[PDB]
Amino acid sequence: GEIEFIESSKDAGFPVINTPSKTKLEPSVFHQVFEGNKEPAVLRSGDPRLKANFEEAIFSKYIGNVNTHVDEYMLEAVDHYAGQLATLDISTEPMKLEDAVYGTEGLEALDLTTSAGYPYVALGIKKRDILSKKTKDLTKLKECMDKYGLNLPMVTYVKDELRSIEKVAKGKSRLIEASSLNDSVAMRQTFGNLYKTFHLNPGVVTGSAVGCDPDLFWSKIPVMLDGHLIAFDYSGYDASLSPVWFACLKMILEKLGYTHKETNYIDYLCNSHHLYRDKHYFVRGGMPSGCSGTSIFNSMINNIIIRTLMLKVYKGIDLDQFRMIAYGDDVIASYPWPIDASLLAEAGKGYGLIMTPADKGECFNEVTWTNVTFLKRYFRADEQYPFLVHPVMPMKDIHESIRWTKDPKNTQDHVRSLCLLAWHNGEHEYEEFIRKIRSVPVGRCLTLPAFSTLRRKWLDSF
Ligand code: NA
């Protein structure tokens, strides 16, 4: 992706979008009990911790585009993956508006908590002013969609989250693009049944883990992934995507039965218009992280990409023996023979993708079931039930998270969520985690699950 044009919003008649510039994150009561290094992301230019130009840093992810046709490798990649998805009988019929807004099996109700985007954010109109869970009212929504239409600008927010010392200093804060409520709803109508099928079928047929429950899904992954593991990281995957990868996505959508008209919304993602505070800008390429379907579309594109690179370097490859599971940029994969990921990475660079060794580190290559991570979690077979696999979030990350809060009123839910991740690290680690929590008075006011209870419920869930 490439920023093609940027100017002051007022020149085009856009008001300044007044997005948050002060973090909602504050030290929790556990801040001194546990060790950690992470701090809130930089949200504004004048932040004293900056050791770089903020506005330059946050847009530096847009590294450019490679301008190419959809080549022979891409075409075969699309064919192969399309053949997998054909198995699922995805419906290209529009999802009914009520289902697409207020919830159905495989597609949770539209989040009423997030930004309603443009122009609502300039009018002080929130999602809850238009929508109502209790009523399932579609009347105001239909009015709004008729009044303002589709293809509205996206509103760029800086993500308010914890970041490493390095990412704070370098000003490498992440951005979220909020699609207008109008476009979110329209895309959910158009692609909702596809969203639904993906959510209901995480695994190696969709090549997707979006919507998965790691407590359950992790025992299935080594069964699905037969051979030598392949994993690598991307640097700035979303923003690196060139228009050619969106063309591939449109081709795969058409093979599923979507019409040229229905795939027009992919152009909205690819060639996008954004508002950031007092500026507005156009991007050619780049997945706008935050719009409807961007996790699923990022995953589908990743399925095309990896196959393309394999076909290009290993002309003798048998993709029918290749398996992969993506969650956006994150990938875990296998092939029955060793594959040199460093070769794939160089082929990736030719397509404007920046691929690096798995989980930082120096080489590409020797990934094992012991060191592989996916969705930030390691894989550890249960010692007693060896066919069941623990997702293991590092205690370091759990410690980082408990030291901060966006609202102390949520302490019970926050700490409980962390317990559900922590116990997979083993009984001794859990017991210590609970002891430290309880060394603060608040900690003794919380309902914390016992290890044996967590383990029992987990075992029973299968
Ligand atoms: Na874009």
In whole angstroms, what separates CA 268 from the centre of its chain? 19
CA of 271 to the centre of ligand 1 (A): 5
Domain ranges of the chain: 1-13+70-202+243-285, 213-242+293-368, 376-462
- Could you give the 3-state DSSP secondary structure of residue 27? strand
Q: Which two tokens stand for residue 212?
A: 């998965």
CA of 88 to the centre of ligand 1 (A): 28
CA of 379 to the centre of ligand 1 (A): 34
CA–CA dist 100, 373 (Å, integer): 33
CA of 264 to the centre of ligand 1 (A): 13
CA of 178 to the centre of ligand 1 (A): 12
Tell me, yes or no, if the two domains 213-242+293-368 and 376-462 fold the same way. no
Tell me the CA distances in angstroms from 213 to 198, 216, 386, one per residue in order.
Answer: 13, 6, 19
Architecture of domain 213-242+293-368: 2-Layer Sandwich (3.30)
CA of 239 to the centre of ligand 1 (A): 8
Contact 198, 211 (CB under 8 A): yes
For 312, residues 6+ apart whose C-beta sits below 8 A from its C-beta are: 73, 347
CA of 54 to the centre of ligand 1 (A): 21
In whole angstroms, what separates CA 215 from the centre of its chain? 18
Q: List, as one string, the DSSP characters of 145-206.
A: HHHH-S-PPEEEEE---EE-HHHHHTT---EEEEPPHHHHHHHHHHHHHHHHHHHH-TBTTT
CA–CA dist 455, 462 (Å, integer): 12
CA of 287 to the centre of ligand 1 (A): 5
CA of 152 to the centre of ligand 1 (A): 13
Declared resolution, Å: 1.8
Domain 376-462: which CATH number of 1.20.960.20, 1.10.3720.10, 1.10.10.10, 1.20.59.10? 1.20.960.20
Contact 156, 276 (CB under 8 A): yes
HSE value, Cβ hemisphere, 13 Å, CA-based, for 346: 5
- Please report, in range form, the residues annotated as the binding site for Mg(2+): 233, 329
CA of 461 to the centre of ligand 1 (A): 40
CA of 43 to the centre of ligand 1 (A): 22
Residue (of 433, 354, 314) closest to 60 by Cα position: 354
CA–CA dist 451, 419 (Å, integer): 9
CA of 80 to the centre of ligand 1 (A): 26
Facing residues of 404 across strands? 27
CA–CA dist 148, 100 (Å, integer): 19
CA of 77 to the centre of ligand 1 (A): 22
Tell me the CA distances in angstroms from 334 to 16, 47, 302, 339, 368, one per residue in order.
Answer: 48, 44, 15, 9, 11
CA of 380 to the centre of ligand 1 (A): 38
- Please report, in range form, the residues annotated as the binding site: 233, 329
For strands 271-276 and 154-158, give the pairing: parallel
